Design a protein around this ligand. Structure first.
Ligand SMILES: OC[C@H]1O[C@@](CO)(O[C@H]2O[C@H](CO)[C@@H](O)[C@H](O)[C@H]2O)[C@@H](O)[C@@H]1O
Ligand SMILES: OC[C@H]1O[C@@](CO)(O[C@H]2O[C@H](CO)[C@@H](O)[C@H](O)[C@H]2O)[C@@H](O)[C@@H]1O
Ligand SMILES: OC[C@H]1O[C@@](CO)(O[C@H]2O[C@H](CO)[C@@H](O)[C@H](O)[C@H]2O)[C@@H](O)[C@@H]1O
Ligand SMILES: O=N[O-]
Ligand SMILES: O=N[O-]
Ligand SMILES: O=N[O-]
Ligand SMILES: O=N[O-]
Ligand SMILES: O=N[O-]
Ligand SMILES: O=N[O-]
Ligand SMILES: O=N[O-]
Ligand SMILES: O=N[O-]
Ligand SMILES: O=N[O-]
Ligand SMILES: O=N[O-]
Ligand SMILES: O=N[O-]
Ligand SMILES: O=N[O-]
Ligand SMILES: O=N[O-]
Ligand SMILES: O=N[O-]
Ligand SMILES: O=N[O-]
Ligand SMILES: [Cu+2]
Ligand SMILES: [Cu+2]
Ligand SMILES: [Cu+2]
Ligand SMILES: [Cu+2]
Ligand SMILES: [Cu+2]
Ligand SMILES: [Cu+2]
Lengths: 334, 334, 334
């Protein structure tokens, strides 16, 4: 059958990304991944609101999988008996059978092994899609992540120059729909099944209660701020499986941006704000020039500041007064 | 006056497209079309919800008109006396007089003949726009379609290679605003006029009750699924006259995509999901690689699965195990 | 310290733009601007609805600032003692300190002077961002504008040809959130502070009551319509600091469009409708071909016609019957 070398990957939780090569001299391999589904009640904000989450590998988003063009991605999807619902997986990077969804439906207690050839480069969403109304419900419950398919020569700028990142982060954005009771408090539920009727009613009204990165308000702040140093080129992969987003690095730019997320297209340069279409992943790289704190947001600022969609970067290095300076500090008007 | 050959087109209902050439050796012609407006009460979902529709040629969307750059498009717009409202037409492909709207206002019982030169290539919306608050109301009642203006040399990839499609489909997406009564059932009305006050109130809240393709939930499924064979290159024109959409072919890609819809720009390649700005048409071509059923959706999955915005393709041919295979069918976890 | 020539600019209120060069033989300068914040109650519609606005220089949007790549932009931001709140400024064109926001927080009675180097070309949002939930509130209260950073050689089409505009207009789009009382009338408030709790509650629901250009329904109509002549190339800069928009010139096109707004990228050509991601500015140029009235809208037509987002152009010149003609005026159907 398929006679290529096998390579296992140990996935790591977002926003971090498992170790990988950008450019590689390896030829095609069968790259082996395991995703174990976990349904669990989680806390999504600083007020203690709870949420019936459904996850790949315990996280929102599911972890970033990284391969190269022409690799074969062999995923063991596991649905333990401790879960209540069937689940599957649709890879937007894959060709056929509803992205794999038609070949991966598993009941609690089952697993399945799907292989797909990575013929399309870029960052792509993966998500659960059991069928019918279950599709949006599983997705907005957290069951989505992304996979990055790099060219074997690494990234380029479309003008012949290599673009090498010093680090990569994966920001998965999640629209969440938590119903409220009559007096206006968020509801808690004993199971995903019990949450479904109220949650679907809200979903159909198309206004989320929360829009978060990495599964919670504030997830990518404080101890868990993203980091960089002045001089480092950082790739930020952003996904949104269900709803549009408009990423922006406050105090920075997107030096090279693939907003549609596909490396067969040259990046755009020098963006302020870019656009992640719901159902996609995109990527932006930026070389930090200034130390200090940055915020990384969706630039619907209501969503960013009030519904949860803000991350921070803490950046080390030397301030550049040529690029920016406070000529006169705040003072009384003359 | 204008001394060119005249060619009549027999329009066909969406999602099909009237016969045309891609590349042509014909020079400019006056291409003659007729659109007859029909106001009618229709059923829009499988529950039997009704809707006061306003249409060009009896369909939602109106039919796709196809011409070549430099042709003159001569449209006889007819508003029969059996209708209740005035109507007109604005072609986004046309130059001057509000796209034609300022030259085509016709009362019931009248017709008008407008000619415009097709100086801009791409796919474009056309829609009714009588004036003032009537503009959105006529559009979201169904009065919109599209027109495709092909280069005379056919389509290309921006790198010198021809792109020829084997077939083309037109998917018109419609945001609909059907009010509900106090207990939560959709309302029915005796005329568009009677539907207006409740419908406008809802419209201004910017949340549709239904988002459909080809005028109804399920229109492009079952007997009426789109079709292809493995090896066929299919062009999918997508329009949305009032509201954004994010098309996605589940199990496929956009091999070549003009998301802004204009053929003077090279297509993007290898997309997962693309973006149709409200007030526009875009186009994507894909060469099918795998047989089976595909879904074509807007990738707000709530809209797709719960509000109506899903089409199917049924594709014939041989499965390609190199691209995808089920290595191990669902089984008990060891 | 920084030993370059200083040049003062006298800002002008939108939609007009202060005098500037496109291509220039000047080298880098320190270009001096002053922005004075004004909190004020204004009328936003033809019904007399009032609104607690917060502005740079008294206008919504704040005025367009125009410089060239490599200039240094030195802004004196003034917060008079007659205001009630602290304020600051974040330039999306700037690098470091949250775009300047971390260096410009001023209480009523204070001013501050910030300099930033214009290292990124394009049109960019600037906006207030005091911190936390105040960020969206100040922005949607009106505290946003834009800055254009031109290449020193002026604009080009990406194919070696200069693009010179005959005039430029700045259309700032504002999503506004005015609460209603129980019977359904818009509320009035005595201060921004008093408006905050009801306004934030509404904001978080993500549906504006009004979407306007230049601060009011109808602002860019009648006496204050935009103007052009047949043959003139007009640049239209469009910004939206918080929420997406989809500009469209009814009866025209975007001949050259930078929808992401950044001049290091070639423009797209021949668009019908383009997309301004919330948190950005973009630009479109069009050479008028036909006289008469045009509407310039967001092509969510509900927003355009019903919530306020329509401007007009009045264009002088000779009608071109080759491009469009009414072959037969409205007449009884035979
Ligand atoms: O960045 C992708 C963009 O760059 C071009 C060159 O303009 O092609 C480059 O990237 C391709 C994909 O990695 C390489 O195959 C090619 O050799 C390299 O020049 C464009 O063709 C492409 O759209
Ligand atoms: O696909 C459009 C894109 O292709 C280029 C070549 O890079 O031009 C091609 O298409 C034009 C429009 O059909 C032809 O006139 C031209 O001859 C052909 O090379 C780009 O200029 C254009 O943006
Ligand atoms: O329009 C920007 C686009 O044009 C290209 C040429 O294809 O570069 C032009 O514009 C640059 C920025 O103004 C100039 O530096 C350059 O000399 C000029 O050719 C592209 O490289 C660019 O993306
Ligand atoms: O109190 N129930 O929503
Ligand atoms: O610049 N950010 O809100
Ligand atoms: O305080 N920084 O976003
Ligand atoms: O990294 N030095 O501050
Ligand atoms: O703060 N005094 O100038
Ligand atoms: O029952 N009327 O909405
Ligand atoms: O892959 N589609 O939901
Ligand atoms: O069952 N297919 O979408
Ligand atoms: O077309 N053959 O299955
Ligand atoms: O289904 N049994 O492995
Ligand atoms: O009447 N108060 O909303
Ligand atoms: O063409 N404009 O609605
Ligand atoms: O009447 N013109 O929009
Ligand atoms: O400008 N002449 O109508
Ligand atoms: O209006 N009469 O043909
Ligand atoms: Cu699932
Ligand atoms: Cu999907
Ligand atoms: Cu009409
Ligand atoms: Cu229109
Ligand atoms: Cu402020
Ligand atoms: Cu900002």
């Amino acid at each position: 059958d398929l006679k290529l070398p096998r390579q296992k990957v140990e996935l790591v939780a977002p926003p971090f990304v498992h170790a990988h090569e950008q450019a590689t001299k390896q030829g095609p391999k069968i790259v082996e991944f395991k995703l174990t589904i976990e349904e669990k009640k989680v806390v999504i904000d600083e007020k203690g609101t709870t949420f019936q989450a459904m996850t790949f590998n315990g996280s929102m988003p599911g972890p970033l999988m990284v391969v190269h063009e022409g690799d074969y991605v062999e995923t063991t999807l596991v649905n333990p008996a401790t879960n209540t619902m069937p689940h599957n997986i649709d890879f937007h990077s894959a060709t056929g059978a509803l992205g794999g969804g038609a070949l991966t439906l598993i009941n609690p207690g089952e697993q399945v092994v799907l292989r797909w050839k990575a013929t399309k480069t870029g960052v792509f969403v993966y998500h659960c899609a059991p069928g019918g109304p279950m599709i949006p419900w599983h997705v907005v419950s957290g069951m989505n992540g992304a996979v990055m398919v790099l060219p074997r020569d690494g990234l380029n700028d479309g003008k012949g120059h290599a673009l090498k990142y010093d680090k990569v982060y994966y920001v998965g954005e999640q629209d969440m729909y938590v119903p409220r009771d009559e007096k206006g408090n968020f509801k808690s539920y004993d199971s995903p099944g019990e949450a479904f009727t109220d949650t679907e009613e809200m979903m159909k009204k198309l206004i989320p209660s929360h829009v978060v990165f990495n599964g919670k308000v504030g997830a990518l702040t404080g101890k868990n701020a993203l980091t960089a140093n002045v001089g480092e080129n950082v790739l930020i992969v952003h996904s949104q499986a269900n709803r549009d987003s408009r990423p922006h690095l406050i105090g920075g730019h997107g030096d090279y941006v693939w907003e549609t997320g596909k490396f067969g297209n040259a990046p755009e340069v020098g963006l302020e704000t870019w656009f992640i279409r719901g159902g996609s992943a995109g990527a932006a790289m930026y070389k930090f020039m200034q130390p200090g704190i940055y915020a990384y947001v969706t630039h619907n600022l209501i969503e960013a500041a009030d519904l949860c969609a803000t991350a921070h970067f803490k950046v080390e290095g030397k301030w550049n007064d040529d690029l920016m300076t406070q000529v006169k500090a705040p003072a009384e008007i003359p």
